[model samples]
Target: MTPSISKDAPIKGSITISKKGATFTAYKLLDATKSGDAYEYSVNSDLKDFFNNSNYGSYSQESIQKLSGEEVKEFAVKLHKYVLDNKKSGKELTDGQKNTVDLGYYLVTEASSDSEGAAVASTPIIVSVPQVSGDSWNYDVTINPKDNTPILEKNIVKENQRVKTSSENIGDVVKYEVKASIPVYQKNAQDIMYKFTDTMSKGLTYDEKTGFKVTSGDKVFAKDKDYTVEVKKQEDGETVITINFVYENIKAYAETGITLNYQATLNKDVVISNKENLGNTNNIQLDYTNNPHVKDSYKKLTDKVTTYTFGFGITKVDSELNSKLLQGAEFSVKDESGKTVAKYTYDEKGQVVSLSGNGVTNSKGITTFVGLKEGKYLITEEVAPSGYSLLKNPVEVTITANKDESGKYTGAATIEISNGNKAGQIINDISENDGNILFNVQIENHAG
Candidate 1:
């Protein structure tokens, strides 16, 4: 299994009264009445992938109106189809759109209590203008509510003048000034994201789990740092004093490849000893002697000093390699000579964490391995798949009990496999450690 570390915080979200599961949704209202007229639409999620610059436009010229009844019917049907198809496209709907569609579908199909048995009123509906080959006119659209018919008439044609309409007109018309409009399109529509956090009434200060103290004038991490240790005798006994100090990045390490740098300082005035007048001083005696008779001890001080520098860099498994690890293949990590360096099975996180399968079954199909404690163990593939040889090197699989980044697997697992075509392919080649199998697996294949 691959490695995983716990995240610094917890994840949280909420559910809507109409939603059974989480959803993404957006909206695109269509109130295209005239130039300079604007409308607003609401969406639940950001539609970053869908919208574009072309969505915004303004009326370029005087309105063109189509008056023939036949043409109007044909255009309305075609336009409605076009808009419906674009709106229902599943690729780039925002979270709000997704939710709206879900709710719309649920209300229509499931007939839930939330359903009002009516379609959402259309907004920002656009209209097309009509013109004779050379004749032009000011255009307007009138929607007859009783019959749901769109009436197209012009205000200026050849000569700028409004079309005549009266109570005695041939058809009832509700006039709407017609003009072209450009929508303000955006790559991201809208997003309804939930951020949940609860603070403790009192600030909690975590105690130092593990760290080191810096001494005055003590060299920290420095570039190209190297060191040589000398067993120097002290008044009390042999002391491991860090000398040749240089500034360097300090790293606090853990076995699971996790590291943190502490940014704390050492308390001043730490007295190593108080009995002797000179013993309490932090200076080192170059002569390796504390006796008062050692007069030249200070003169013998070495000019060589080690400085330290502190910085941080994290170790990450490459994405491509992580993809390979997902296949649940047993392989040994080797150096240039192909000698085993690190080995183990992998979880999706792509680190040597957790065994392939915790429970084990004996030849009789009875499980002898169950509820194994969490820790690292050496693994060997004693059995190989047919036509496949065992890996030359062994691997060590460390099953961690710590929380992963998603907090899903404190002690859980996921297995991915590839090329399980042949029968009995490395079926549970778990290495026996201390007379127990660290993990277990059984691969079987039939006709694909």
Candidate 2:
């Protein structure tokens, strides 16, 4: 008997029986002929020659028979054992085979007759078969499915949005936004542990009582109920905030979107002259309990904030003996260490534009310097005013914080630039107009 495998089922295991015996009973077998005395035999043996050998008696007498019910039962047990052994030592099943095993079993058997006299032979009948699910003997084994991983993001920015940059003004409120997205694989999941961590740059000040917000999809989440936020200040003045989501609420937000918002102040503690980038980074993580193949997921993102520095200006006049404004007097500025800081150009107003350096006196005796970082500088005359004498010494200018004794920066600085000339030419006055400083000089021609 051969068991049938199904095309649509996962045929993980199967059984087949090939033997000789007559199916006289569901649990036993009998002879096909009832002549003389009733005889029973089990074609369980391959002794084919015993039935048609010329040395034996008549066909009926020569045929092996009289097998007891007990013997038949023993054969049934051994048949079941053979089926199990084949299944255990079998090769890995393919998709079609895996499918076939679950589809259940089919049983078939056959008998044969020799070309000789009345001698007939039969295959070992399955006198008895073990109990199998359905009509077919099919056993199934299943494997667990893989788990899905989650994804996260933070600090999403937009144009004109209140994000930190390389150049910022003092006391400016820098806003930041963080977003966490549920991965497609984690949609409709349950019992997930979700968390977000934000680290603020040292120069920024964060307040949990204000400027903090959280939202999920279209609904705003309540603090302490839907989520919890914990703020920590490092010994070095950095700020860290952690937000943990409640399982009761985060469960519904799986495979969805969550957002957070907050603000930090740009304070005087920041480095104004150097690259003081106010950077803020955020991280998010999720732990899934239902996934068998994966344990957790995490992601991190960062952003930076910055502020701009101040600049300087200058004006050139004739020497003390001369009252006319002088044009074409070239000047250049350097840092405290004498490093050239600004270059020169002509503006639409005919004024000397300090492209980046502090040089150039234009038609109006005016030189403008813009976008200079906070620091002391030196202004030296490289070329004398048209028809004027060159000065022997360079001047020093100090630009410092315009703060009171309290140390609070007034968002402004004090600038003082002076020029000293030789006896023949003198600086008449040094003053401020608008945001620029004007210097008056007079030049005396050769005295008779």
lDDT of each: 0.22, 0.43
Give candidate 2's root-mean-square deviation (CA, Å): 28.6
- Regions of candidate 1 where Cα sits further than 4 Å from its true position: 1-339, 343-409, 421-437, 443-448
Which window of 10 residues has the lowest lDDT sum in candidate 1? 305-314
TM-scores for every candidate against the unseen true structure: 0.15, 0.34
Task: Put down candidate 2 lDDT per residue, 188-245, tens digits, no spaces.
Answer: 3344555666766565677565756886544578988998888889897778777877
Query: 1-448, model 1: which lDDT tens digit per residue?
Result: 2112124211221112223222212222221222222212222132222222133111112111322443322223232333354664222222212121221100011111122111111111122221112232212222111212111121211123322210100011112111111111122212211111111011111113322222111123332342222233344422233322211111110001111122111111111110111111112222221122334221122211111111000111112232111122332222234433231222233222323432122222222222222333333444443334444434333333333364322223222223232221223333322222223333321111
| lDDT for model 1 | 0.22
Off by over 4 Å in 2: 1-153, 156-166, 183-191, 274-448
Relative to the true structure, candidate 2 reaches a TM of 0.34
